[PDB]
Every structure is written in C-alpha cells, then in structure tokens.
Amino acid sequence: MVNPTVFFDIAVDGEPLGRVSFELFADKVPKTAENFRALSTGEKGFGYKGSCFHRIIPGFMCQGGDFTRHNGTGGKSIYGEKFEDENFILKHTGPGILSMANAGPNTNGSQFFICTAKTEWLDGKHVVFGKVKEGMNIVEAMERFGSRNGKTSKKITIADCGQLE
Numbered sequence: 001m002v003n004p005t006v007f008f009d010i011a012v013d014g015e016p017l018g019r020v021s022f023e024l025f026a027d028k029v030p031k032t033a034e035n036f037r038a039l040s041t042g043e044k045g046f047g048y049k050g051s052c053f054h055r056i057i058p059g060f061m062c063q064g065g066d067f068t069r070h071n072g073t074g075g076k077s078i079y080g081e082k083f084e085d086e087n088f089i090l091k092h093t094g095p096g097i098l099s100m101a102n103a104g105p106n107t108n109g110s111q112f113f114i115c116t117a118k119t120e121w122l123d124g125k126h127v128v129f130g131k132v133k134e135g136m137n138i139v140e141a142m143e144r145f146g147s148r149n150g151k152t153s154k155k156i157t158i159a160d161c162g163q164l165e
C-alpha cells in the first residue's frame, strides 16, 4: 500500500560519498517498480550492488545499472532479458526523476537513469518509475565527476544498496 523506498550508498574510486534514497511509484507502475526494488535488494541473486554509473552528463542525467557488461550495453531484468514499457503515466518533470533506459520500444532491462534536468523529450519513450527522496545533494556531487561525453573522471559505484523501512 505504501510505495517502497530503496537506497544506494555511493562511492567515488572506493571512497564513500553518501546515500541516495528513492521512492518507487509502485502505485502507478508496479511491474517496473518491482524490478528496480528487487535489483536493489539482490533477492533474485543478481542486482545493482557493486555496479557503476557508467555515463554521467552534467545537466542531463546519471545512468547506471549495467551489471552484466558494465558499459551501457547490458543488464537484465527480474522477468528475463527485457520487459515491456509498462505505461507512460509519469513524466520527466525535473531533476531527481528515476527512469528506465532502453534500446527501443519494449526493451527495459536493468539500466536506469536519474535526471539532473528536465528531460521532457523523453516523455512517452522512457518509463518513469521513481524519484529521489533524500540525497539529491549526493547526486549533484556525483554529477560533478561526469563530462560532456558521459565518461566519468573517477569510478562512481553503488557500494551497497537495499530497501528501507
């Protein structure tokens, strides 16, 4: 009944930075929210723990969740390799939005991005499923290690992750 909350403890070249928490909109996109929740807890035997944010573009977004190829070409969901676009009820309204990365229609896996700006051109193309609840300061700090082309100057990792409450 209560939307679940998940957390990521972020490190920069192995050094703790801080924690980002997210509210997952299970009330509006339950199947997508559940995939991210389970990847965050690792309860299916695979997930986000130890993965990195491989592409960070200041003023745009930080992208991660590729735990099979570590570069933006991999990932898999709890439902199989890919899963469908659940719905496009929620929009990319500004910094803090959590949304699914994809490679075309109906190709969601495990990759996700956190908006650091409004990305309205993505509406109806990428499934929005959550928002940052605490630690937008930590996202902003992360963002400073990106670049115009997305390559990061230090390695930004999810050192730990899980479910709160």
Ligand SMILES: NNC(=O)c1ccc(N)c(N)c1
Residues within 6 Å of the ligand: 072, 073, 074, 075, 101, 102, 103, 104, 107, 108, 109, 110, 111
């Ligand atoms: N778009 N480039 C990719 O290789 C890719 C990007 C996102 C994904 N979820 C998957 N599976 C692949």
